[model samples]
Target: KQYTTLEKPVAGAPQVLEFFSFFCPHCYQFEEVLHISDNVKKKLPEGVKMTKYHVNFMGGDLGKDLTQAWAVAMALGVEDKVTVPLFEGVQKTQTIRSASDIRDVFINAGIKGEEYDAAWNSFVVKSLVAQQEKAAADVQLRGVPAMFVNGKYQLNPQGMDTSNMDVFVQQYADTVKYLSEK
Candidate 1:
């Protein structure tokens, strides 16, 4: 697991990668702010990319299965659909206890068909899962919404020990712009 702050090369803009978990309520709530304002789409650098990397905080079967599902979806081009449902499943539940439960949500969300199974077993899925592990080792990404700008500045976009969403987003926007200028 290698985690280093890689520079955003010329011709490629910085990326904001969010490492999240299906079982985290905080991540689900934070999604609202990040999704609103269309900020991610509207405010990204000209060539910048925004990605959400789902992780397993609970570990064991539930964690591994959810992580695999996310990886497969990413590989198969359906991660956009998987992201919210997986989070919502966790958010709606009293507790995320089993991988089967998560799978049920995924199945209901239209993520599990023949193609989905193939994707789940693909090399890309394996690589993505490995990347998730690497990300955990490199940064203190203990939960969802833990962010990195251009792979340089680490941010808690919603805030910690503070309830100022405006301040957080402003700082996030400014910091990203600053990194881009540098």
Candidate 2:
């Protein structure tokens, strides 16, 4: 019941949406270190997918570039190797200092340097970044680490009981299933 029904809900298959930013420490823990989304993803019913939207409002232009970094990595299907390491550079390692440095993560992860270059400026990445920026505002999110079930229900991130992370994630996963069925 910790959800707000959207006035303008998005359309998609049964999927959970995570609106996150690497610049946000809470997101780093939620998605990166703790694997909250990863675990919830696994608990989803068949054909349900986990969708992540990288918001551009966190750290200015650099935040925008970081979002682009995710688009490119996921675009190439190498995110399994690229996503984890890239986040570390931005949030933990402090290696990615500028927007231009975003390409380094792709290159280091075996994505061809040329492929990274092309996709960095490709129409696909541009549109992906564009959509997420519009969506972050469309959903009217109050903060990062936000979750939505089937784009129609925005879970109150602060309302969740986090006393037990394990049980909490299961309930979180169950909530996604519950709302998705609605």
Candidate 3:
């Protein structure tokens, strides 16, 4: 094995949770280019959702602030629109750095100041980001692009053969399907 069984398993809907960070170049390639979320959903059974849980450790001091962007964007329901822009800014052009940079990305995606500020200040986002941090700390997560099936079974990306993207994608999808049912 690639993955280890969790001593304390999380219980919830059958969803895949990915521990990732915006500052992680590997996460950008995996999420944006490879599109693991789309592929994983196809292999997973119906009603299964994929949650991209951003970790705080990857960005060091800027980690929590960066993670909050995901929660805030999610609260505004502009996640789909902002995800790619955020990834590109951070990994492609290396333009994103501070929270303000993240805010600009949201604005560029058409989220107005009032709406962005509303979600940015909401308790809903506060709680969700806390949960994101807690989950990573609990897992002792030290890397990005790590996936969990049903929020319990960790599917190690390291175990997947990445010599070929096609092989990697199939193996990744197959393991997610297998673990979702297990």
lDDT of 1 at 46: 64
Instruction: Please report, as a residue range, the 10-residue window in candidate 2 with the lowest summed lDDT.
Output: 9-18
All-Cα superposition RMSD per candidate:
5.2, 2.0, 1.7
Candidate ranking under lDDT, highest first, comes to: 3, 2, 1
Clashes of 1: 0
Against the reference, the lDDT scores of all candidates come to 0.62, 0.77, 0.80
Tens digits of lDDT, candidate 3, 45-106: 67876677778777766678778888997677777898899888877887888888889998
Q: Give the residue spans of candidate 3 off by over 4 A.
A: none
Error of 3 at 5 (Å): 1.8
- Candidate 1 global CA lDDT score: 0.62
Cα error of candidate 3 at position 112, Å: 1.0
| lDDT tens per residue, model 1, 78-175 | 76666676665666654546755655655776765676766767887899899877766566565565666555666544343335766555555665
List the candidates' TM-scores in order.
Answer: 0.73, 0.88, 0.91
In candidate 2, which residue ranges exceed 4 Å CA deviation? 11-14
